[PDB]
Subunit: 133 residues, 6 copies
């Protein structure tokens, strides 16, 4: 019975997919506990959110993209919410993600991938405290 | 122009939040701000419905609106107010048109899923309530 | 707080529209009280169901069509169910039925019109007693 | 071949009956018979789950299955049993695949929306229960 | 009866092509012919809208119809022309009904997703333009 | 990268064209060209399936591909060919996954709704057949 952190990503708004995405998680019976809409997220928050990735080649590109448009931070709650939402999310790679998943049905790029979901209890607590202090 | 939308507790009870927001997103309105409320302060609800204070049902209304979560959304777009009101549909289940949010999804005069500003003024008004 | 009688019609099965139809009534929050599936309805029942129409030119054609395939008889229950379901149904005429209605979005013929719904409390009681003695 | 499907009480509680039946109808299976049960007789449920009598959860199972309405459907089609079982998805929320009925809609090992026969024999079996 | 329908550049821009076509498909209208245009020649466009050559919008309308891809489809069915015109909905985003393509999905007088013939007259002109 | 996709006669028969196309549209693949065929010339079909000329099914496969309309589409996107092949799903109704076009909607080895190129190889053969 955990809580997880999701980010509806800028490309979701660009392609008008916000409702479709959220609705998938909603149809899977998870509940909303918190929700904040950011027209433009503060870069600090984005940097923290992705700190484990600060050394990679795509960091600066990813940070740029995460602020290229609005974003919704959601906290969902449900039995084993973290691992279950990560399955709905789908693989980061457009050559891996299964048809049926959010990324498999709707995303076609390794970066513009519509949705973030906490990968673990640790990262989930950490991420929740960032978007919801 | 801009308009204020409330996703109502019966939406969360029936898991129709995405469906409702979905219909606005497709009509091509932009979210300008949004707040999720696990339970709206009552006086907030009551200010929100101040024009209704005198009506018989005003109590059941405020009750219903605090009986679960609520999302307040400000939408933006050309003629957002009148357009989104058309989408919303009539308050009365006996009158709401098929094709509308209430027409397709609502079956009750009170639990009718969605609020939207009725005019420019009420929009400015309701907006500054949920979003100061 | 009434009950009404619906018939999912043979063309609904032919075009695989049974779920779509029922789902519209289900999304409008009406409840199922009774449901019977007929691979082929007895002609007697169809004749009774449409008795008010026994003098018309289309009676024999309509009866033939109502037995040309399966049919589901449903009884729904809800506040003012009869008049509300009749609005979802849409006009019998493909030149009248509004986009948004079951017939307006999906039917294109005056006879092959997917769905029957009781027109009145009287006809509703009567019809319910036919399909559900 | 033919298979037996149960639409479960949590489907009626979440208004997902059409959605579930919807996914089978689209995979192109025909309904051969269907019965709506406002409340299934308990021994019917218990015969239905006879192979489970020994399991810890068997009580909560039977309880759940009589806590609301149920639709018993016999579907028909080539390899209906194995195909519809694939659609259904895994029993465990931790394992059900996105794309499946349980994968997309179920979030709990017990309240998992839909039963379908696991084999030819259980099909013949469960069918004659709900439909003699 | 037959009718000409254009899926317009804003449909491709907002990825609503299958949605528009799906609505017509749903009402049981059958495709008699169809061509995808990565970019229509402006002369076809001006021909298509020749009746409109004297209006303030004519030039912008035409610029728009070449700003992106277009799909030309001849649809066929009993009364396809009025029936599809109804599906299509009113041109004005302030008048088009919920339930119609424009009413649900359009929010602009010019960027309205779909063209549809208005008569047997224009049905033949327009089919002849796009399909000779 | 580009790829050839055929919407097959069973798609038209079951009115699933917009549904199939919508799935590909959803994944952000863009149409480069498209033609509707009320009935394909059998030579195009045999060309298209030339690699298959020695199989028991070849003749039936071809009969089927002419039994009704077909839509030929060249789709374009990063890795369109494998990506769309995945969307499409396995040929065998006993193997295609829920979530895929065939897995959700097909129930037959031959009447499987959609063709999609298997390689850059066949991508060019097939595009050249349908679009020269
Ligand atoms: C691995 C990778 C990630 N990214 C971006 C997009 C990812 O959503 C984000 C975080 O990476 P990661 O946590 O690996 O992906 P996921 O979002 O599936 O958990 O970094 C790239 O742009 N390129 C890459 O090669
Ligand atoms: C008119 C009416 C409204 N209400 C509730 C539901 C309405 O959403 C709310 C305000 O009514 P109103 O502003 O007329 O409806 P709308 O929400 O369409 O603007 O009060 C009742 O409970 N009973 C009634 O008879
Ligand atoms: C009026 C009419 C009805 N019918 C058939 C189809 C109708 O569903 C059925 C009953 O007629 P009616 O009760 O008028 O229509 P509805 O189903 O909308 O209540 O008779 C025709 O075939 N042709 C006609 O001209
Ligand atoms: C395995 C299991 C099943 N059940 C319930 C839900 C199952 O639908 C039912 C029978 O289990 P089973 O037949 O294994 O699942 P399926 O329904 O996929 O065939 O018993 C539990 O409540 N807890 C459990 O741990
Ligand atoms: C009336 C009008 C039309 N248009 C454009 C959009 C219309 O699709 C097109 C032709 O107008 P018209 O034929 O009246 O609309 P419809 O598309 O319903 O046939 O011209 C404008 O740009 N501005 C306007 O004020
Ligand atoms: C393997 C196989 C294919 N077919 C038909 C359906 C296939 O779409 C077509 C070509 O086969 P193949 O290229 O293997 O399938 P795909 O469509 O996945 O490329 O031949 C049969 O009719 N029977 C069979 O046993
Ligand atoms: Mg991660
Ligand atoms: Mg108001
Ligand atoms: Mg009647
Ligand atoms: Mg079993
Ligand atoms: Mg006009
Ligand atoms: Mg192959």
């Amino acid at each position: 019975l955990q809580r997880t952190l999701v980010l509806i990503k800028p490309d979701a708004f660009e392609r008008s997919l916000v409702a479709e995405i959220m609705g998938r998680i909603e149809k899977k019976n998870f509940k909303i506990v918190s929700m904040k809409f950011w027209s433009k997220a503060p870069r600090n928050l984005i940097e923290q959110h992705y700190k484990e990735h600060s050394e990679q080649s795509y960091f600066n590109d990813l940070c740029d993209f995460m602020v290229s448009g609005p974003i919704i931070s959601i906290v969902y709650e449900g039995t084993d919410a973290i691992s279950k939402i990560r399955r709905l999310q789908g693989n980061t790679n457009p050559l891996a993600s299964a048809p049926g998943t959010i990324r498999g049905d709707l995303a076609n790029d390794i970066r513009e991938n519509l949705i973030h979901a906490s990968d673990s209890e640790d990262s989930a607590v950490d991420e929740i405290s960032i978007w919801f202090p």
